[PDB]
Short mmCIF file of C-alpha atoms and ligand atoms in Angstrom, two decimals:
data_model
loop_
_atom_site.label_atom_id
_atom_site.label_comp_id
_atom_site.label_asym_id
_atom_site.label_seq_id
_atom_site.Cartn_x
_atom_site.Cartn_y
_atom_site.Cartn_z
CA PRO A 1 -61.82 152.84 92.08
CA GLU A 2 -64.65 150.82 90.42
CA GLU A 3 -65.95 149.96 94.36
CA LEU A 4 -65.88 152.59 95.55
CA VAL A 5 -69.60 153.73 96.70
CA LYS A 6 -69.93 156.77 94.89
CA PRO A 7 -72.62 159.99 96.84
CA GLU A 8 -75.88 159.80 95.17
CA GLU A 9 -75.96 155.99 96.95
CA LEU A 10 -73.87 156.97 100.35
CA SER A 11 -76.37 159.45 100.25
CA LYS A 12 -79.39 156.89 101.14
CA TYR A 13 -77.29 154.86 104.33
CA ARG A 14 -79.13 154.29 107.59
CA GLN A 15 -77.96 152.97 110.86
CA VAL A 16 -78.06 149.41 110.21
CA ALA A 17 -77.06 147.68 113.19
CA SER A 18 -76.64 149.34 117.23
CA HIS A 19 -74.70 147.17 119.46
CA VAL A 20 -74.35 147.86 123.34
CA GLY A 21 -73.24 144.66 125.08
CA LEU A 22 -68.92 145.23 123.21
CA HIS A 23 -68.17 147.27 126.84
CA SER A 24 -69.21 147.10 130.41
CA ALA A 25 -72.87 148.36 131.38
CA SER A 26 -72.26 149.43 134.48
CA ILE A 27 -69.40 151.82 133.00
CA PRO A 28 -70.73 152.97 129.67
CA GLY A 29 -69.61 154.62 127.21
CA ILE A 30 -67.45 153.90 124.28
CA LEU A 31 -64.12 156.52 123.63
CA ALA A 32 -62.36 154.94 120.85
CA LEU A 33 -62.50 152.96 117.44
CA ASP A 34 -60.98 151.72 115.11
CA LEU A 35 -61.23 149.28 111.92
CA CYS A 36 -58.44 146.52 110.98
CA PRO A 37 -57.12 148.53 107.45
CA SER A 38 -56.90 144.68 106.17
CA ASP A 39 -60.75 143.50 107.00
CA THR A 40 -62.51 146.11 108.21
CA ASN A 41 -65.30 144.14 109.67
CA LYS A 42 -62.82 143.05 112.37
CA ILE A 43 -63.66 146.30 115.07
CA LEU A 44 -61.54 147.43 117.49
CA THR A 45 -62.91 149.67 120.79
CA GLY A 46 -61.96 151.08 123.86
CA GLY A 47 -64.31 151.48 126.44
CA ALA A 48 -64.92 153.47 129.74
CA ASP A 49 -64.46 151.00 130.91
CA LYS A 50 -61.42 150.61 130.63
CA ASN A 51 -61.02 147.53 128.43
CA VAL A 52 -60.15 146.90 124.58
CA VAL A 53 -62.64 145.48 122.91
CA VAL A 54 -62.03 143.06 119.29
CA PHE A 55 -65.22 142.66 118.01
CA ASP A 56 -66.89 140.53 114.10
CA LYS A 57 -69.09 143.36 112.48
CA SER A 58 -69.72 139.73 110.85
CA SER A 59 -70.28 136.69 112.71
CA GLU A 60 -71.42 140.32 115.75
CA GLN A 61 -69.52 138.12 118.56
CA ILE A 62 -66.92 140.02 120.63
CA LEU A 63 -63.15 138.14 119.39
CA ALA A 64 -61.76 139.37 122.58
CA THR A 65 -61.60 141.58 125.48
CA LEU A 66 -58.56 142.69 127.10
CA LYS A 67 -57.87 143.42 130.27
CA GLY A 68 -55.34 145.46 131.74
CA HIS A 69 -55.38 149.48 131.19
CA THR A 70 -56.20 151.36 134.41
CA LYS A 71 -58.15 153.97 134.09
CA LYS A 72 -60.55 154.62 130.66
CA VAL A 73 -59.04 153.71 126.83
CA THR A 74 -59.37 156.99 124.86
CA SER A 75 -57.13 155.90 121.44
CA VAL A 76 -57.24 152.38 119.71
CA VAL A 77 -55.27 151.35 116.69
CA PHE A 78 -55.42 148.06 114.60
CA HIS A 79 -52.70 146.24 112.80
CA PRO A 80 -53.30 145.54 109.57
CA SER A 81 -51.90 141.62 110.47
CA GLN A 82 -54.72 141.61 112.64
CA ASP A 83 -53.28 139.42 115.48
CA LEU A 84 -52.15 142.46 116.72
CA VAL A 85 -53.76 145.66 118.35
CA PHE A 86 -52.81 149.20 119.75
CA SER A 87 -54.93 151.50 123.02
CA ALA A 88 -53.45 154.15 125.17
CA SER A 89 -55.08 156.07 127.84
CA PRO A 90 -54.75 158.60 130.91
CA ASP A 91 -53.79 155.51 133.29
CA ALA A 92 -50.44 156.74 130.98
CA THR A 93 -49.62 153.42 128.98
CA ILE A 94 -49.68 152.42 125.43
CA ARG A 95 -50.52 148.85 125.09
CA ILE A 96 -49.61 146.20 122.37
CA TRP A 97 -51.79 143.45 122.46
CA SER A 98 -52.22 139.91 121.10
CA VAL A 99 -55.76 139.06 119.49
CA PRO A 100 -55.62 135.24 119.57
CA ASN A 101 -53.75 134.74 123.16
CA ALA A 102 -55.59 137.93 124.52
CA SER A 103 -53.18 139.08 125.96
CA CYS A 104 -50.96 142.23 127.15
CA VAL A 105 -47.76 141.57 125.15
CA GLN A 106 -46.06 145.32 125.26
CA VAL A 107 -46.69 148.20 128.14
CA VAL A 108 -45.26 151.11 126.39
CA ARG A 109 -44.45 153.76 129.68
CA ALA A 110 -43.15 156.55 127.16
CA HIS A 111 -44.59 159.41 128.32
CA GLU A 112 -45.57 161.14 132.47
CA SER A 113 -49.24 162.08 131.32
CA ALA A 114 -52.40 161.10 129.42
CA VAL A 115 -51.66 159.38 126.13
CA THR A 116 -53.39 161.68 123.58
CA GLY A 117 -52.72 160.36 120.20
CA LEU A 118 -51.39 156.95 118.94
CA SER A 119 -51.06 156.81 115.01
CA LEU A 120 -49.06 153.39 113.33
CA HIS A 121 -46.01 154.23 110.91
CA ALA A 122 -46.66 153.01 107.24
CA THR A 123 -43.57 149.97 108.04
CA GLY A 124 -46.76 148.91 110.43
CA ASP A 125 -44.04 148.63 113.18
CA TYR A 126 -44.04 151.67 115.38
CA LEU A 127 -45.68 153.55 117.20
CA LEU A 128 -46.23 157.49 117.09
CA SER A 129 -47.78 158.57 120.49
CA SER A 130 -48.65 162.45 121.75
CA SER A 131 -49.22 163.60 125.62
CA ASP A 132 -49.97 166.36 128.08
CA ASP A 133 -46.36 166.15 129.17
CA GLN A 134 -45.69 167.46 126.82
CA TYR A 135 -43.63 165.06 123.95
CA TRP A 136 -44.32 162.91 121.58
CA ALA A 137 -42.73 159.60 121.21
CA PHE A 138 -41.65 156.50 118.71
CA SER A 139 -41.53 153.41 120.06
CA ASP A 140 -40.90 149.96 118.56
CA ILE A 141 -43.28 147.57 118.06
CA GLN A 142 -41.63 144.48 118.82
CA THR A 143 -40.16 145.50 122.03
CA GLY A 144 -41.63 147.65 123.04
CA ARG A 145 -38.35 150.08 123.21
CA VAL A 146 -39.02 153.78 123.52
CA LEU A 147 -36.83 154.92 120.57
CA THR A 148 -37.35 158.84 120.92
CA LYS A 149 -39.03 160.97 122.39
CA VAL A 150 -39.16 164.92 122.20
CA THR A 151 -40.84 168.29 122.34
CA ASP A 152 -40.83 171.75 121.82
CA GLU A 153 -38.82 173.73 123.91
CA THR A 154 -40.17 177.14 122.20
CA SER A 155 -44.33 175.50 122.14
CA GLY A 156 -43.84 174.01 125.78
CA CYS A 157 -47.42 172.46 126.11
CA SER A 158 -49.56 169.47 126.20
CA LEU A 159 -49.90 167.94 122.42
CA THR A 160 -53.53 166.75 122.69
CA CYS A 161 -53.16 164.15 118.87
CA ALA A 162 -50.57 162.44 116.79
CA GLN A 163 -51.20 161.57 113.33
CA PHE A 164 -48.36 159.52 110.54
CA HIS A 165 -48.63 161.28 107.18
CA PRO A 166 -49.95 158.29 104.91
CA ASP A 167 -45.41 157.82 103.25
CA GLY A 168 -44.12 157.97 107.21
CA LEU A 169 -41.52 160.86 107.10
CA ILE A 170 -43.91 163.43 108.16
CA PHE A 171 -46.94 164.05 111.56
CA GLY A 172 -48.22 165.94 112.87
CA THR A 173 -49.10 166.78 116.92
CA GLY A 174 -52.13 168.94 117.55
CA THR A 175 -51.24 171.44 120.26
CA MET A 176 -53.93 172.72 123.29
CA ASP A 177 -52.76 176.33 122.55
CA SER A 178 -54.35 175.61 118.33
CA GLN A 179 -51.09 175.26 116.91
CA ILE A 180 -50.79 171.95 114.35
CA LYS A 181 -47.09 171.56 114.85
CA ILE A 182 -45.27 169.75 111.29
CA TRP A 183 -42.69 167.24 112.29
CA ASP A 184 -39.69 165.77 110.38
CA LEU A 185 -39.36 162.13 111.45
CA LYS A 186 -35.69 161.59 110.45
CA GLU A 187 -34.32 164.97 111.76
CA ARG A 188 -36.85 164.69 114.84
CA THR A 189 -37.25 168.65 113.73
CA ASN A 190 -40.15 170.53 113.58
CA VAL A 191 -40.93 172.01 110.12
CA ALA A 192 -43.56 174.01 109.82
CA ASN A 193 -46.79 175.08 111.91
CA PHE A 194 -50.63 176.23 111.63
CA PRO A 195 -51.46 178.44 113.42
CA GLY A 196 -55.55 179.92 112.73
CA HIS A 197 -57.47 177.67 114.59
CA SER A 198 -58.77 178.76 118.12
CA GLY A 199 -58.82 176.77 121.95
CA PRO A 200 -57.15 172.97 121.87
CA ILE A 201 -56.72 171.37 118.59
CA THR A 202 -59.48 168.15 119.27
CA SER A 203 -58.26 166.11 116.09
CA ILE A 204 -56.06 165.80 112.77
CA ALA A 205 -56.39 163.88 109.95
CA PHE A 206 -53.82 163.59 107.05
CA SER A 207 -55.47 161.71 103.54
CA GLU A 208 -54.58 159.17 101.41
CA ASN A 209 -54.11 161.97 98.48
CA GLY A 210 -50.96 163.19 101.05
CA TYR A 211 -51.82 166.94 100.13
CA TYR A 212 -54.43 167.40 102.26
CA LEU A 213 -54.42 167.42 106.14
CA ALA A 214 -57.94 168.35 108.08
CA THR A 215 -57.49 169.74 111.41
CA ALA A 216 -60.25 170.18 114.00
CA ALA A 217 -60.49 172.13 117.37
CA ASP A 218 -62.36 173.81 120.30
CA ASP A 219 -63.80 176.56 117.77
CA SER A 220 -65.99 174.38 116.09
CA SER A 221 -64.43 174.34 113.00
CA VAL A 222 -62.84 172.24 110.13
CA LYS A 223 -59.86 173.70 108.79
CA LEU A 224 -58.67 171.91 105.17
CA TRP A 225 -54.41 172.30 104.69
CA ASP A 226 -52.98 171.67 101.14
CA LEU A 227 -49.32 170.23 102.43
CA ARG A 228 -48.15 171.83 98.96
CA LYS A 229 -48.64 175.23 99.72
CA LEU A 230 -48.69 175.32 103.71
CA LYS A 231 -52.23 177.16 103.67
CA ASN A 232 -55.48 176.58 104.30
CA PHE A 233 -57.43 177.25 101.46
CA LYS A 234 -61.04 175.93 103.11
CA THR A 235 -62.51 176.42 106.72
CA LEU A 236 -65.92 174.31 107.61
CA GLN A 237 -67.02 176.28 110.59
CA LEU A 238 -69.87 174.93 113.08
CA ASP A 239 -71.63 176.52 115.33
CA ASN A 240 -69.62 177.34 118.78
CA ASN A 241 -71.89 174.45 120.65
CA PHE A 242 -70.99 171.81 118.24
CA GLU A 243 -67.77 169.82 119.50
CA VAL A 244 -65.31 168.04 116.54
CA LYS A 245 -63.47 165.28 118.05
CA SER A 246 -62.94 162.90 115.46
CA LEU A 247 -61.79 162.78 111.48
CA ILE A 248 -61.18 161.07 109.23
CA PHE A 249 -60.85 160.37 105.72
CA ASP A 250 -62.07 157.02 103.76
CA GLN A 251 -59.71 155.13 102.13
CA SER A 252 -59.99 156.85 98.30
CA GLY A 253 -60.02 160.72 100.29
CA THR A 254 -63.32 161.07 98.88
CA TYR A 255 -64.57 161.20 102.13
CA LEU A 256 -63.94 163.43 104.83
CA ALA A 257 -66.00 161.96 107.87
CA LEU A 258 -66.49 164.29 111.14
CA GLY A 259 -67.51 163.17 115.31
CA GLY A 260 -68.47 164.62 118.08
CA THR A 261 -71.59 166.20 118.89
CA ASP A 262 -73.13 164.46 115.74
CA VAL A 263 -72.12 162.78 112.29
CA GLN A 264 -71.67 164.04 108.95
CA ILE A 265 -69.44 163.50 105.45
CA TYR A 266 -68.64 165.79 103.17
CA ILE A 267 -67.54 165.15 99.42
CA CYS A 268 -63.55 166.98 99.20
CA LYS A 269 -64.16 167.91 95.95
CA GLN A 270 -67.03 170.27 96.22
CA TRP A 271 -67.47 170.40 100.23
CA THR A 272 -70.71 169.15 100.44
CA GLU A 273 -71.72 167.52 103.06
CA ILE A 274 -73.25 164.04 101.59
CA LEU A 275 -75.16 162.43 105.48
CA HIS A 276 -76.41 163.10 108.27
CA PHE A 277 -75.80 160.94 111.53
CA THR A 278 -77.62 162.16 114.66
CA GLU A 279 -78.61 158.43 116.18
CA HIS A 280 -76.21 158.10 119.01
CA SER A 281 -77.86 160.35 122.75
CA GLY A 282 -75.28 162.47 123.63
CA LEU A 283 -71.15 162.47 122.34
CA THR A 284 -69.87 160.88 119.67
CA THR A 285 -66.44 159.55 120.33
CA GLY A 286 -65.32 157.71 116.74
CA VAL A 287 -65.75 157.81 112.62
CA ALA A 288 -64.76 154.84 110.55
CA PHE A 289 -64.74 153.75 107.32
CA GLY A 290 -65.86 150.05 105.89
CA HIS A 291 -64.03 149.19 103.42
CA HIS A 292 -65.02 150.90 99.59
CA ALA A 293 -66.63 153.13 102.04
CA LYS A 294 -69.52 150.41 102.16
CA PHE A 295 -70.60 150.71 105.55
CA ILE A 296 -69.57 154.34 108.33
CA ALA A 297 -68.86 152.71 111.69
CA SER A 298 -69.58 155.46 114.32
CA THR A 299 -69.18 154.66 118.70
CA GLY A 300 -71.08 157.15 121.60
CA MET A 301 -71.08 157.52 125.01
CA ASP A 302 -74.52 155.83 125.34
CA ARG A 303 -72.06 152.50 124.81
CA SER A 304 -73.23 151.58 120.91
CA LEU A 305 -71.10 150.57 117.89
CA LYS A 306 -73.21 151.59 114.71
CA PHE A 307 -73.14 150.50 111.51
CA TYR A 308 -74.43 152.71 109.18
CA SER A 309 -75.28 151.14 105.43
CA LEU A 310 -77.89 150.86 102.66
NA1 LIG B 401 -66.62 175.44 120.89
NA1 LIG B 402 -81.78 161.33 117.64
#
């Protein structure tokens, strides 16, 4: 892709903005981040303040402050239609919102305890969720109906994150007992399990190349899996104090970002570190790539949404 920002140019990025007014000053912190895939200048954040916010990077305006969650917001997903956004929370709900009406259109109650992960299906019509209640669920966006809800009797433990593979046939759920469980959506079956981590899985990310999966856990490692071989071919081991809270590949699969203790970006081809930011004070809760990796975005417990670019 001619437009993609290459490593030499990416390596020169610096903080270009830091916005602290998206969420409440008295209940400080942003806990979740997503960018709209059809326009990455539209930003979605979940707050410690229980609110979901849509913000325009270009105009630097809050387009909507979406209220209704009764606990902090820990997952957010931006639909490509631009007018739908999704959130989830320790209040055990998944909420579907209209941006233009600044309203909640559905409250999906698939779970009995905190919802730990949220992922939009390839079709754009369904949401996958994971929970501490040990189940995953697949829910219809338009009716809020829970279409299926499944757990592993054998594993029987809290699911800590969930992501669809980009083709929309399989997905992964991380567990509290350090497993990455791969599921076949159609058959509702657990088709493989990737062990090797220690401690709770914290984040998983599927690459757009369709064959890489990156996983992180409390063992302060990021493990890379080739789904064709079902093997862990590379592990990035950080220090044992480091918390990896968020993983994401850029849209091209060229780069992998991690965030938590701080923000780091690796080149997938050579697994070389290409950017490292330590601007946030305290935990970084989200990281994302703008279109063509033309900017990076991050969110922090320090209240800020930061953009990094030339
Ligand atoms: Na650790
Ligand atoms: Na610093």
